[PDB]
Amino acid sequence: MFINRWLFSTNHKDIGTLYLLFGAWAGMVGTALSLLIRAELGQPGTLLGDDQIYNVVVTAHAFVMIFFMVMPIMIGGFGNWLVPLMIGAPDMAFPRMNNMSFWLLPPSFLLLLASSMVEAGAGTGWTVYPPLAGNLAHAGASVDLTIFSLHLAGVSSILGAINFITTIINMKPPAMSQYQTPLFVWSVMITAVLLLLSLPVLAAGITMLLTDRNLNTTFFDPAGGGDPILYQHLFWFFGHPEVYILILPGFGMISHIVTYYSGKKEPFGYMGMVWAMMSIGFLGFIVWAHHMFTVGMDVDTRAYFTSATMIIAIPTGVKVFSWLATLHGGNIKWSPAMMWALGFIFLFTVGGLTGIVLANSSLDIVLHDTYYVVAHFHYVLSMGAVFAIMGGFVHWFPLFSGYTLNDTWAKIHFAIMFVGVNMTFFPQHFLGLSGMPRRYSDYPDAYTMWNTISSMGSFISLTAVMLMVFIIWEAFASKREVLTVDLTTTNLEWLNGCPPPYHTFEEPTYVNLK
Amino acid sequence: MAYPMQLGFQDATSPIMEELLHFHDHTLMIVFLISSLVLYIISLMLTTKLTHTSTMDAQEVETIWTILPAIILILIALPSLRILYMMDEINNPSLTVKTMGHQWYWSYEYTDYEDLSFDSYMIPTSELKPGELRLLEVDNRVVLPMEMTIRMLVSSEDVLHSWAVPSLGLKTDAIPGRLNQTTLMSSRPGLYYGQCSEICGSNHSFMPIVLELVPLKYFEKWSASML
Amino acid sequence: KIKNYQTAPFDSRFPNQNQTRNCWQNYLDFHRCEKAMTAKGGDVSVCEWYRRVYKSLCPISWVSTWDDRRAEGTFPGKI
Amino acid sequence: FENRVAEKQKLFQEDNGLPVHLKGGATDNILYRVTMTLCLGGTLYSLYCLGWASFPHK
Amino acid sequence: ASGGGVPTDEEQATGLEREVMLAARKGQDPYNILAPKATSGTKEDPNLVPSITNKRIVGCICEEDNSTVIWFWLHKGEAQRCPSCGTHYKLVPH
Amino acid sequence: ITAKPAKTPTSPKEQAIGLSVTFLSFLLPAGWVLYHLDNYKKS
Amino acid sequence: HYEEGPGKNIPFSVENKWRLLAMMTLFFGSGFAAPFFIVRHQLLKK
Amino acid sequence: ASAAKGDHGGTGARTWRFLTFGLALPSVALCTLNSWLHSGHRERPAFIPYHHLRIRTKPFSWGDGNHTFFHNPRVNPLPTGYEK
Amino acid sequence: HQTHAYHMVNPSPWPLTGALSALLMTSGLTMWFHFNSMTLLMIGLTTNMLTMYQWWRDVIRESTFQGHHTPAVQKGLRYGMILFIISEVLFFTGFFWAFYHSSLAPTPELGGCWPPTGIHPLNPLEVPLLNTSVLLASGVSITWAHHSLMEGDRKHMLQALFITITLGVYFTLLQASEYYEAPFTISDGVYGSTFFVATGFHGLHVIIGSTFLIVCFFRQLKFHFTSNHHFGFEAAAWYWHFVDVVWLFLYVSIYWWGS
Ligand SMILES: CCCCCCCCCCCCCCCCCC(=O)OCC(COC(=O)CCCCCCCCCCCCCCCCC)OC(=O)CCCCCCCCCCCCCCCCC
Ligand code: HEA
Ligand SMILES: CCCCC/C=C\C/C=C\C/C=C\C/C=C\CCCC(=O)O[C@H](COC(=O)CCCCCCCCCCCCCCCCC)COP(=O)(O)OCCN
Ligand SMILES: CCCCCC/C=C\CCCCCCCCCC(=O)O[C@H](COC(=O)CCCCCCCCCCCCCCC)COP(=O)(O)OC[C@@H](O)CO
Ligand SMILES: CCCCCC/C=C\CCCCCCCCCC(=O)O[C@H](COC(=O)CCCCCCCCCCCCCCC)COP(=O)(O)OC[C@@H](O)CO
Ligand SMILES: CCCCCCCCCCO[C@@H]1O[C@H](CO)[C@@H](O[C@H]2O[C@H](CO)[C@@H](O)[C@H](O)[C@H]2O)[C@H](O)[C@H]1O
Ligand SMILES: C[C@H](CCC(=O)O)[C@H]1CC[C@H]2[C@@H]3[C@H](O)C[C@@H]4C[C@H](O)CC[C@]4(C)[C@H]3C[C@H](O)[C@]12C
Ligand SMILES: C[C@H](CCC(=O)O)[C@H]1CC[C@H]2[C@@H]3[C@H](O)C[C@@H]4C[C@H](O)CC[C@]4(C)[C@H]3C[C@H](O)[C@]12C
Ligand code: CUA
Ligand SMILES: [Cu+2]
Ligand SMILES: [Mg+2]
Ligand code: NA
Ligand code: NA
Ligand SMILES: [Zn+2]
């Protein structure tokens, strides 16, 4: 029964639990990698004494955080747990294919581990640009294992996207239109359309890299008439959609959390929030070359990409102001989840605004490939995704587990984390403006003070992660079983109790049309 | 070069870099304002016992918060694009210099008249003369005439690199098989520093760029002294 | 003998950041011209402009590789 | 050929508690064990190969 | 030849597919494929909510085009009202 | 949210144990590797 | 059929909080330790 | 944009069989003829060791490492030229 | 029990064996490319084929034999197959992008022209045109099969599907012969790279599609399909039209425009 239940699952909740477990474990790996990065930079000189290893650590840090921590937690974990419950469905459309999306990830992760253990690792950047990632500058198996790791993660998410789109379109109650489905369900649907369209292009691109490295193709090799910049276009045609994939389920959870702890039955401006997510998803496909403003493109192309990129601020701002307008007039419950969501709104806004700075290709000449970009995305992506994830975990942990957290401990954990991430990343703006490149194992002496402070910040967030583990233990250790939650009339996922039975909605909800 | 505890951009050495500084001041003011308004409004929403939990109508307020961001974006984009098109307009240089990236050093070619070329390596920390800068000096600097429009052509003989000099507002990727152009104009004599800006392997952190800007007559003497 | 040559001027055929084709075209132009001028009545001095431009713009290793391949019979452009 | 679908419908609807991947009878079990043995053995072999490839081989 | 030899659903559908097909013939919806049409929802004319058991979750879209659905368990016994719009619902077991 | 009283309450002493054990499980292995970095770099 | 309810819908036991603490410590500690040991492995390789 | 054919009234199997045998398979027959007229081998061209062709940055994982997967000795020269 | 129409699937080992097969194939390719051995790759290919066979066998058991494919379940499978085909279109789009990027801006290494110096393309009016007529014809014949099935005509469904499969096999053998006769190779710069990777992935999809049609052929022989319920046949036809449309784009782009 253990193997049948946990290895042969066809249950959306159990598969969601596997994803949350996997993502949490990956989060520990990616955190350890981030601390090694900051240890190398925490004083001038060399710590590891091997900058190829440093580059391998940076590369792995990013792949682990994006592909094994954020997307499995948001889409595989919260998506599988919550989406069928929020639409009253009895499971996902393809419950058995769903289990394969999960089980592809431990092999994917194993292939990434293998990449770093054989030869000298893939010290390429998570972008894996040729020719550095080609078979002369990265000879041997490491880059190919990385490519295969990405193929398996890609198949996992493409099939998961097929599952979520089908579920959400096809398995709502017959009376419920798409404009009666909760915003988190919208956010997953749109994220899934972005994955469906973007990951195959990445797959095409890394497959061409594979064949340049092993079958004597020259897609990216000028000696055969190829072009390194073609790889960049294919990569970023996937990679800009990817960053919106990483935040969109977060936007969906934030809408639910802010609504809930403002004591509201609904988010402010629902159709605007749907519009804004669809607009961000659409614009997210026509901006990718803002990752390429220094490669030598024509001025009119740089002008188009500057302009198109900035337009995304308009729908994003509608969502930010609408969250504020949801708080407006609320009976505010200062829960730990609410704290995470409030920190999200502010830190995501800061990060989005430095993204608008970078959108200006003239200024990006001086800021590209510097710590200003690192600061931008650790605000908007790293803090953005982590705070939405923490807010969602604290809010829904009692649903998934049946047990309550200690709220005081959870607030302490929030406080430590908020200090730690801001001490870590805010000084990196100064390092970027003053010209410190990213992807460096050591820096000119002038940059010492802010690197020292940033590394000290990284340890504070380590203390938070450790505390988070203790807090989860304490909840399972004390076994305070949930009785009731408020606002179930507008939060259907709670209405089958905590945790819900293995099968829910065997008798579907009754919704009439009138 | 950067200096300890620096918060902003290196001092501008070229007119285009001055333009960027003014454009950044303009944009950062907007960033500060919007960030601070969001923070304020969060605190405003959270500091009253008054409530209103029934459905709120959204249409009117959404005109404001699409039109006003649209106007702000236009006020960023107009100076942004003006500077973009300035950088691109015809500058008619008096000198072309090529630089080729390698793992891990730069080489330079001055082939307008004489066929001069040479390699430029970081000085190891153990060899720095007293008072010289760790990770930044090179053995052979890029001698150039000040107050003159110079065409730099950038490429690579192996992996990607990127040739950058922050105080001149310059960063151009060095791509094998491709010859990227940028223009360089220093308002001042002196030494101007930069660092490889596209990850290129083991020693990415250790292949810096040093320009040495001098009056034309001294540039010519130096050129002349190379034959 | 019109010279006063300093460096290659702006060429409206090649107005963007990628200058590869400008180097390539003048390299071809010079060598096509220098071949033509081995007919009866020709001197390579007429080819000088292309020569100065490609020497100014082209990386030395590109010129050297192209020269080597012209001598091997493996140059892929038409001269 | 004749239409024998009804007899397969009777077989696969028999209330014997078997999951669908084993409900055809003893051949299903054989094919399953072959498959799983190859998968788990290959996975063990792949881990062996990682170990081998993780260290320089002289 | 333009002949035959392809089974029909009536001949060969089985299991739940066949139950759905047969119920559709009789105009019944035991598997909840259709959205029910509301009554006036008064106390005298409550919406009648079938269930195989003694409680079922109702979602109430109180006005046409509301995006917010109001969810609650409806129990056997006296009709209950939507906590948002007050329309009445009465469970009819099975 | 409302909840039944803890089935198996975790005293402050019990918490101090779980916290210390948790923190040690992160810190000791990483500490061992980092302490011995120079023993690695010289091999 | 499977067990349901708090502490029964998970692939690890919470019957004993100290056994749990060992499990969680091995679980999260193994993931956190792994990058330090891979770095060690690469530094030691040659 | 519908060719010069023209036969509906309630589409069906009979019409699509008519297209299959009356248009589609005749087209295949005609292209098969066309093709099995212009078949026969062309003069293979002088070998020139162009550096953008016969690329070898890593040996192939079969044979001697220097032959492509569907190598045809009559028309595929190696980096050093045609085979004996 | 349930009173919805959706399918609660029995716990299954095939997701796990499929995921492990993926680990074995990719680590197997790595070992082939770098450590001169096909062992892991052969195990992975074998377990992948075993996984697909048993998984789709079980889907047949669940639907033809157990009745779980209600109209709602079928509707879900229609969406799933359309979405899968869309993802496959985007995969090919990446290869077309690479082709147009290289061919619209030929670099000096090529001769600054397209086709590159030294490349002698196939004549698109010879076997490539025949292949085009073959796949177009099989789109007509599979539509005849579809209508015959809907009209209850077993014999003509089987004839038309047989013709469709025969044309798919003919395409594959023609393409195998053209690969062998081609005077250029995958190592012939970006021309060979784009040609063989793009037509090669397409050829793989022709083999996949043909195999899917063969599965349908045998299921039809065994009377699995009704005149109204036959989604495996509809999915294989959709997939087959997708393979035909990709070919037309390849023919116009790489063979004809690129020659
Ligand atoms: C929670 C705490 C954790 C601890 C870690 C730190 C957290 C961050 C809090 C820190 C509290 C932040 C208050 C504004 C910071 C601006 C500092 C500055 O002087 O910046 C200067 C400029 C460049 O300026 C120059 O070229 C000239 C510099 C010198 C000016 C002349 C005076 C000479 C002396 C200067 C003395 C200092 C001046 C400062 C003047 C101070 C004015 C406020 O650099 C930059 O652009 C860097 C900007 C990065 C872009 C992000 C902007 C959005 C942030 C708005 C809310 C803060 C979020 C904080 C993140 C969250 C904070 C809550
Ligand atoms: C969660 C992930 C995430 C998100 C959501 C974003 C959002 C944005 N990003 Fe960022 N980005 C990354 C993750 C993300 N980014 C990553 C990982 C990289 C680097 C990859 C690498 O190189 O490794 C990166 C890199 C990156 C670059 C390339 C920089 C370079 O390498 O030189 C650029 C350039 O334009 C950019 C711009 C933006 C913009 C304009 C947004 C916008 O969508 C932000 C819109 C939000 C706001 C503007 C705030 C809220 C709005 C209001 C309150 C309204 C009023 C505001 C105005 C009128 C301005 N990003
Ligand atoms: C007959 C019609 C065509 C049918 C298909 C033929 C075989 C293709 C098999 C799979 C095709 C998919 C990969 C395409 C990779 C390259 C193969 C290109 C097609 C082909 O077969 O190309 C041949 C070379 O094959 C070679 O290198 C060897 C190829 C064998 C090793 C391939 C290893 C790479 C596989 C990578 C898979 C990545 C998949 C990722 C999917 C991710 C999804 C998200 C061409 O032979 P040639 O002798 O060079 O020139 C002929 C001269 N007379
Ligand atoms: C470099 C080498 C890389 C190698 C990577 C290898 C990766 C994976 C190993 C794959 C093994 C596949 C095993 C067969 C999977 C069959 C899935 C399937 O057919 O899923 C179906 C749903 O997907 C649908 O329809 C529509 C979708 C059908 C998907 C079929 C499988 C495709 C797997 C590869 C996809 C790649 C993406 C391509 C685009 C880039 C059925 O869903 P179930 O939940 O099962 O059942 C529901 C029941 O009601 C049925 O009665
Ligand atoms: C030489 C061998 C080479 C091997 C490599 C891959 C090989 C071959 C794979 C060929 C695909 C075969 C798929 C067979 C699926 C059979 C199961 C099936 O068709 O199942 C049908 C459901 O469809 C469904 O799940 C639809 C299921 C969708 C299947 C989609 C398959 C596409 C697979 C692509 C995989 C590779 C991707 C590309 C790589 C780059 C069952 O429903 P019905 O038909 O209505 O029947 C019910 C009636 O009888 C009731 O009266
Ligand atoms: C980036 C995250 C890292 C966070 C920093 C970790 C904080 C410190 C945790 C403690 O780590 C321990 O430190 C000891 C030193 O205090 C080491 O003992 C070492 O040093 C001792 C004293 O010299 C000897 O007795 C031991 O045998 C010798 O192994 C021991 O190995 C190590 O586990
Ligand atoms: C028409 C549509 C849906 C309305 C509904 O059926 O409920 C609504 C939803 C969100 C609205 C948009 C958003 O509110 C954002 C923009 C707000 C401006 O005031 C008008 C244009 C604007 C782009 C809106 C146009 C239109 O009213 C939208 C698109
Ligand atoms: C045996 C079967 C009879 C139909 C039925 O069983 O009622 C018949 C009907 C159609 C026949 C098939 C179709 O005519 C198509 C093919 C015709 C080829 O000449 C032989 C094989 C071929 C595939 C036939 C095999 C067999 O004779 C089939 C399959
Ligand atoms: Cu050269 Cu980085
Ligand atoms: Cu982007
Ligand atoms: Mg760069
Ligand atoms: Na360092
Ligand atoms: Na049909
Ligand atoms: Zn109501």
Residue numbers in the entry:
A (entry chain N): 1 to 514
B (entry chain O): 1 to 227
C (entry chain U): 7 to 85
D (entry chain W): 1 to 58
E (entry chain S): 1 to 94
F (entry chain Z): 1 to 43
G (entry chain Y): 2 to 47
H (entry chain T): 1 to 84
What does the original paper state about this entry?
pmcMammalian mitochondrial cytochrome c oxidase (CcO), the terminal oxidase of aerobic respiration, reduces molecular oxygen (O2) to water, coupled to proton pumping, providing charge separation (membrane potential) and proton gradient across the inner mitochondrial membrane for ATP production by FoF1ATP synthase. The O2 reduction site of the enzyme contains two redox-active metal sites, Fea3 and CuB. Electrons for the O2 reduction are transferred from cytochrome c on the positive side (P-side) phase of the inner mitochondrial membrane (inter cristae side) to the O2 reduction site via the two low-potential metal sites, CuA and Fea. Each electron transfer from cytochrome c to the O2 reduction site is coupled with the pumping of one proton equivalent from the N-side to the P-side.
